[PDB]
Amino acid sequence: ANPYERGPDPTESSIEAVRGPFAVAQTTVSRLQADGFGGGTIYYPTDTSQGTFGAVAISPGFTAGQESIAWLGPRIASQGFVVITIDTITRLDQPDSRGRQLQAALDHLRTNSVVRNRIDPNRMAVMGHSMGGGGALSAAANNTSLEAAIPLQGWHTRKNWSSVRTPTLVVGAQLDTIAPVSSHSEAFYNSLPSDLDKAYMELRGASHLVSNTPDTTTAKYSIAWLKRFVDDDLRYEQFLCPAPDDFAISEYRSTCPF
Ligand code: NA
């Protein structure tokens, strides 16, 4: 049996839910308390009886605050994850810096009295929007032990991600004019190793701002990816492989089966 499985067996509805089966609470990390990042909010399951959970850090994009990605925190955490949404050291930080800050936020969790005993520090993942998504790719490229990476409308000047060894879901927005999929998201997917567990999902009709207010398609597939790779939870592969029969997705590619 897989000791990292959490929660009941999933369905389409369970991964679309605004709140999953775990009640959650939150705690604030001040900028002063944060070493190597700008502070953040940690969302965590309150139930201690089901084991420890994997950890996820999420970065906003250029000039943006944690508020622009906050909704992802409790929506993901309620599926059985400890999730920290960060502010960056400065609003002007570029993607490589954001990646180091994502790693610093993950490493902070094991020192946080509220959540340290709720996490498995060996099972960590990174996500982010725009330059924060470029940051997620950089963090994976700088730490081959990370279990998953999810750039959401990622932006980066680096297009070649051939050294990434972390299963990566690239989420593009079809109409994005800020991080256009042709030169960002799709280029990243294409240069990730051909034998990596990876997928590309383009959100039909979506703008760059799709990640900044609740989007069920973004949430459901991010949840399934984190379950499949942070928890190695094979119950979630059915949602990722093959292409979903889902009108909200305008393009899909993957290296399924994983
Ligand atoms: Na894994």
Numbering used by the authors: 2 to 259
Paper text:
PHL7 has a leucine at position 210, whereas other known type I polyester hydrolases harbor a phenylalanine. To explore the reason for the considerably higher activity of PHL7, we exchanged leucine 210 in PHL7 with phenylalanine. As a result, the activity of the variant dropped to the level of PHL3. Residues G62, T64, S69, H130, S131, M132, W156, D177, A180, H209, N213 (catalytic triad in italic) are conserved between PHL7 and LCC, whereas F63 (LCC: Y95), L93 (F125), Q95 (Y127), I179 (V212) differed. Figure 2A also shows that the active site pocket of PHL7 is more open than that of LCC. However, the plasticity of these predominantly hydrophobic regions near the active site may contribute to binding of larger PET substrates and be a key for a more tolerant recognition and effective processing of PET at elevated temperatures concomitant with increased polymer chain mobility. We modeled this ion as sodium due to the electron density at this position and the high concentration (100 mm) of Na+ in the crystallization buffer.
Herein, we report a novel polyester hydrolase (PHL7), isolated from plant composts with a high efficiency to degrade amorphous PET films and post‐consumer PET thermoform packaging. All of them contained the GXSXG box, a conserved Ser‐Asp‐His triad and an alpha/beta‐hydrolase fold. The polyester hydrolase PHL7, isolated from a compost metagenome, completely hydrolyzes amorphous PET films, releasing 91 mg of terephthalic acid per hour and mg of enzyme. Structural analysis of the enzyme indicated that leucine at position 210 contributed to the high PET hydrolytic activity compared to other polyester hydrolases.
